[PDB]
Design a protein around this motif. Structure first.
Motif, PDB file in Angstrom:
ATOM      1  N   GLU A 278       0.805  -1.214   0.000  1.00 40.55           N
ATOM      2  CA  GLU A 278       0.000   0.000   0.000  1.00 40.55           C
ATOM      3  C   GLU A 278       0.840   1.267   0.000  1.00 40.55           C
ATOM      4  O   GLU A 278       0.385   2.306  -0.497  1.00 40.55           O
ATOM      5  N   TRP A 279       2.062   1.200   0.533  1.00 39.69           N
ATOM      6  CA  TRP A 279       2.878   2.394   0.702  1.00 39.69           C
ATOM      7  C   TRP A 279       3.366   2.976  -0.617  1.00 39.69           C
ATOM      8  O   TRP A 279       3.918   4.081  -0.615  1.00 39.69           O
ATOM      9  N   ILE A 282      -0.946   4.059  -2.467  1.00 37.91           N
ATOM     10  CA  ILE A 282      -1.673   5.209  -1.926  1.00 37.91           C
ATOM     11  C   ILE A 282      -1.042   6.531  -2.338  1.00 37.91           C
ATOM     12  O   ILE A 282      -1.771   7.412  -2.831  1.00 37.91           O
ATOM     13  N   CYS A 286      -2.887   9.529  -4.596  1.00 38.97           N
ATOM     14  CA  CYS A 286      -2.973  10.880  -4.051  1.00 38.97           C
ATOM     15  C   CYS A 286      -2.363  11.892  -5.012  1.00 38.97           C
ATOM     16  O   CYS A 286      -2.961  12.937  -5.301  1.00 38.97           O
ATOM     17  N   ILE A 287      -1.171  11.588  -5.529  1.00 40.01           N
ATOM     18  CA  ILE A 287      -0.498  12.500  -6.445  1.00 40.01           C
ATOM     19  C   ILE A 287      -1.307  12.666  -7.723  1.00 40.01           C
ATOM     20  O   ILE A 287      -1.449  13.778  -8.243  1.00 40.01           O
TER      21      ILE A 287
END
Ligand SMILES: CC(C)CCC[C@@H](C)[C@H]1CC[C@H]2[C@@H]3CC=C4C[C@@H](OC(=O)CCC(=O)O)CC[C@]4(C)[C@H]3CC[C@]12C
Ligand SMILES: CC(C)CCC[C@@H](C)[C@H]1CC[C@H]2[C@@H]3CC=C4C[C@@H](OC(=O)CCC(=O)O)CC[C@]4(C)[C@H]3CC[C@]12C
Ligand SMILES: CC(C)CCC[C@@H](C)[C@H]1CC[C@H]2[C@@H]3CC=C4C[C@@H](OC(=O)CCC(=O)O)CC[C@]4(C)[C@H]3CC[C@]12C
Ligand SMILES: CC(C)CCC[C@@H](C)[C@H]1CC[C@H]2[C@@H]3CC=C4C[C@@H](OC(=O)CCC(=O)O)CC[C@]4(C)[C@H]3CC[C@]12C
Ligand SMILES: CC(C)CCC[C@@H](C)[C@H]1CC[C@H]2[C@@H]3CC=C4C[C@@H](OC(=O)CCC(=O)O)CC[C@]4(C)[C@H]3CC[C@]12C
Ligand SMILES: CC(C)CCC[C@@H](C)[C@H]1CC[C@H]2[C@@H]3CC=C4C[C@@H](OC(=O)CCC(=O)O)CC[C@]4(C)[C@H]3CC[C@]12C
Ligand SMILES: CC(C)CCC[C@@H](C)[C@H]1CC[C@H]2[C@@H]3CC=C4C[C@@H](OC(=O)CCC(=O)O)CC[C@]4(C)[C@H]3CC[C@]12C
Ligand SMILES: CC(C)CCC[C@@H](C)[C@H]1CC[C@H]2[C@@H]3CC=C4C[C@@H](OC(=O)CCC(=O)O)CC[C@]4(C)[C@H]3CC[C@]12C
Ligand SMILES: CC(C)CCC[C@@H](C)[C@H]1CC[C@H]2[C@@H]3CC=C4C[C@@H](OC(=O)CCC(=O)O)CC[C@]4(C)[C@H]3CC[C@]12C
Ligand SMILES: CC(C)CCC[C@@H](C)[C@H]1CC[C@H]2[C@@H]3CC=C4C[C@@H](OC(=O)CCC(=O)O)CC[C@]4(C)[C@H]3CC[C@]12C
Lengths: 352, 103, 52, 47
Positions: A278-279, A282, A286-287
């Motif tokens: 997920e790191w 996500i 978002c970007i």
């Protein structure tokens, strides 16, 4: 310059006085009995006959009548299309066919007057395409035995209706309050294209990456294009691009293999847990959302503002130049009302 | 709004014969689409049914006509681009143009 | 799986080069150039947003 | 505000950038990209 504009206005209003207000003449148009009264001051060169005949020859009233007729035709078309459609056509559909026939006759007249230079205009191409689509729809619909032809003809007619409806924008460019604003729309194509170019680049990149790092070997073009393109595009107005980036909510919609019509599942691991981290997902989403939803739209707003500020002063003379063509074209014809025009041409072939 | 609503109602449902739902589908939903929600959830065949009503006995929208095999008949490859184009034209360009003119 | 992820990120990196190689169209290039002059506003917005 | 300020100045910067592109492209041998690899193949032979 003022002189030519005054000449055109006087020719457009015909016999009627230029000082007569518009609402009075419109109201008199709906109710004919007030023609023989003081409602409108002609101020132009027994008496009742001349008063009446001159009224139904000014291009202003003919244009208003044609607008009303077009609106009525649109209403009838919609009613027939989505409220009364059967294998065997009924009387309203026949009336619609007659109206389309008279419109086709008018278009034939337009073709005759001009030549190949006629097709250089865009609205003419749109009108011809609409007529051809209507003819194809009739051809498909006349096959009553087979139902699929009926559905196909209905779809064709719906698209033709879409094409027809947009002509209201073109025919309302003479209001003197909306026309100038309608004209300026031609000068904002480049900003739209630039915005679309950037948006498409980002969309493709994000969709390809997300599909690659989550699912394995789809082998189905439908869902490939559904996931790569459709969802990121939808993310531009509102909803977050994907609810799959988070492992908290998932499953119960998966499909191992492609037996069912659902998206392919996320590949699992030896312990039967999701494998993607997920790191990295996500921050990516978002970007992407920050880049697309916010900055690009505001940039587009700024460019539109600058373009409007630049071109507002120049738009007016272009609008007047366009107004000239309308007045001339309307003054050319015989100015007979649209529904009763068909009779006139009826004798032209007799007389020519 | 008028163009899109008329087309979408025409190519999906057949012979409503109810003014209430006619105006509810033709006008109300496309207008609502201007601020937020997508104009229709019916353009996609994946989610549908359980809210239909054969005939007009109940107060629900008329159902999409089926085929010989009892499957939806409308194609998606024309509906989806139509709604995408409508949303792009309405929600974005027009509002920004209005902002510029106000400025 | 790790190699697949690496390739996906490399694809992300590669795809953005289309912006650079299209700065010569004579219709889009001028608009692409001006993007360099809007970093400070973005940073200020992000600063306030992060504080709140 | 920033767009309004910098729109006038952007054009000459764009032209200045255009110059570099033209020069760099004119420098090379201008062989098509897929068939370039052969050219360099003999450079080491010739140098
Ligand atoms: C079941 C559905 C298909 C019915 C269709 C609804 C019609 C009644 C809509 C379709 C287009 C609409 C028209 C689109 C444009 C105009 C012009 C508008 O007036 C102006 O823009 C000019 C004002 C000025 O310049 O002074 C008044 C409404 C009208 C006739 C709208 C009123 C209602 C119309 C005819
Ligand atoms: C349910 C339906 C049948 C109601 C709609 C009635 C329409 C036939 C009415 C509503 C608004 C009217 C329009 C309002 C304003 C104008 C402009 C008017 O004069 C001009 O075109 C401008 C000329 C100039 O500025 O010099 C001509 C009629 C028109 C289109 C009117 C003609 C008839 C319209 C479309
Ligand atoms: C890729 C294909 C198969 C999809 C079909 C897309 C159409 C819905 C697009 C293609 C061209 C577009 C048209 C291009 C130009 C115009 C004129 C525009 O109005 C004006 O610019 C008025 C200018 C003037 O009056 O001089 C309104 C939209 C329209 C019809 C656009 C609306 C939508 C159209 C028909
Ligand atoms: C890019 C800028 C402009 C937006 C602001 C940044 C934050 C939205 C990002 C930056 C780093 C992100 C974090 C990086 C790593 C994680 C751990 C992650 O949980 C796991 O990775 C579980 C590990 C496992 O799979 O076992 C939850 C989100 C979080 C806090 C991420 C959530 C969002 C953060 C704070
Ligand atoms: C916290 C570390 C920052 C130094 C990084 C984290 C996320 C980065 C951002 C990720 C995405 C973008 C959009 C990007 O926009 C463009 O260059 C044009 C593309 C477009 O507008 O769609 C500019 C840099 C920015 C703000 C990056 C700049 C530096 C940021 C804020
Ligand atoms: C109009 C522009 C500005 C927006 C970007 C375009 C995409 C949003 C459109 C263009 C063509 C569309 C595709 C055309 C056809 C299909 C197949 C469709 O699936 C079916 O047609 C199933 C066929 C069946 O019914 O059996 C799913 C959507 C997809 C990928 C469409 C989804 C969205 C796409 C990629
Ligand atoms: C990819 C092919 C492109 C050439 C087509 C696909 C969809 C088209 C668009 C469909 C809808 C519109 C809105 C249209 O806007 C108007 O003319 C005024 C109407 C309004 O603003 O509501 C201008 C053309 C545009 C961008 C069309 C222009 C050409 C596009 C991008
Ligand atoms: C399964 C997925 C990964 C397929 C990928 C889709 C491609 C077909 C996309 C990726 C990038 C796209 C391109 C991005 C930029 C442009 C330039 C654009 O033209 C211009 O911007 C220049 C116009 C001018 O200046 O006159 C036309 C579309 C094109 C080739 C786009 C069309 C389609 C491309 C090649
Ligand atoms: C499914 C895929 C394979 C279709 C995409 C085909 C592309 C190879 C086409 C689509 C648009 C084309 C571009 C449209 C416009 C231009 C600008 C043209 O001239 C310039 O670069 C500007 C020079 C100047 O202004 O003086 C060079 C080709 C290019 C990039 C064209 C080259 C080929 C492109 C990318
Ligand atoms: C904190 C880290 C680990 C997260 C990774 C964030 C990246 C996605 C950010 C960091 C720097 C960003 C880039 C900084 C500058 C640019 C150029 C920008 O385009 C231009 O400004 C063109 C200007 C010109 O042509 O001269 C588009 C985005 C890009 C690649 C930005 C996009 C996203 C990048 C690679």
């Amino acid at each position: 310059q003022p002189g030519v504009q005054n000449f055109l206005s006087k020719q457009w209003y015909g016999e009627i006085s230029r000082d007569t207000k518009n609402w009075k003449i419109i109201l008199c148009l709906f109710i004919i009995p007030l023609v023989g009264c003081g409602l409108v001051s002609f101020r132009k060169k027994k008496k009742l006959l001349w008063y009446y005949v001159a009224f139904f020859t000014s291009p202003f009233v003919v244009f208003s009548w044609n607008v009303v007729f077009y609106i009525a035709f649109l209403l009838l078309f919609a009613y027939v299309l989505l409220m009364d459609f059967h294998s065997v056509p009924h009387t309203p559909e026949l009336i619609l066919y007659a109206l389309v026939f008279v419109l086709f006759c008018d278009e034939v007249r337009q073709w005759y007057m001009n030549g190949v230079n006629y097709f250089t205009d865009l609205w003419n191409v749109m009108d011809t395409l609409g007529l051809f689509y209507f003819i194809a729809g009739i051809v498909f619909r006349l096959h009553s035995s087979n139902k699929s032809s009926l559905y196909s003809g209905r779809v064709i007619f719906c698209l033709d209706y879409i094409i027809f409806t947009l002509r209201l924008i073109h025919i309302f460019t003479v209001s003197r309050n909306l026309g100038p604003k309608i004209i300026m729309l031609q000068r904002m194509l480049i900003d739209v294209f630039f915005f679309l170019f950037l948006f498409a680049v980002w969309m493709v990149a994000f969709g390809v990456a997300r599909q690659g790092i989550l699912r394995q070997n789809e082998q189905r073009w439908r869902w490939i294009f559904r996931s790569v393109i459709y969802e990121p595009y939808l993310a531009m107005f509102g909803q977050v691009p994907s609810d799959v980036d988070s492992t908290t909510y998932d499953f119960s919609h998966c499909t191992f293999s492609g037996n069912e019509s659902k998206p392919l599942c996320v590949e699992l691991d030896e312990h039967n847990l999701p494998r993607f981290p997920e790191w990295i997902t996500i921050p990516l989403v978002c970007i992407y959302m920050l880049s697309t939803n916010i900055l690009l739209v505001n940039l587009l707003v700024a460019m539109f503002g600058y373009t409007v500020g630049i071109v507002q002063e120049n738009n007016d003379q272009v609008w007047k130049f366009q107004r000239y063509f309308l007045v001339q074209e309307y003054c050319n014809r015989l100015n007979i009302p649209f529904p009763f025009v068909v009779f006139a041409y009826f004798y032209m072939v007799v007389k020519k």
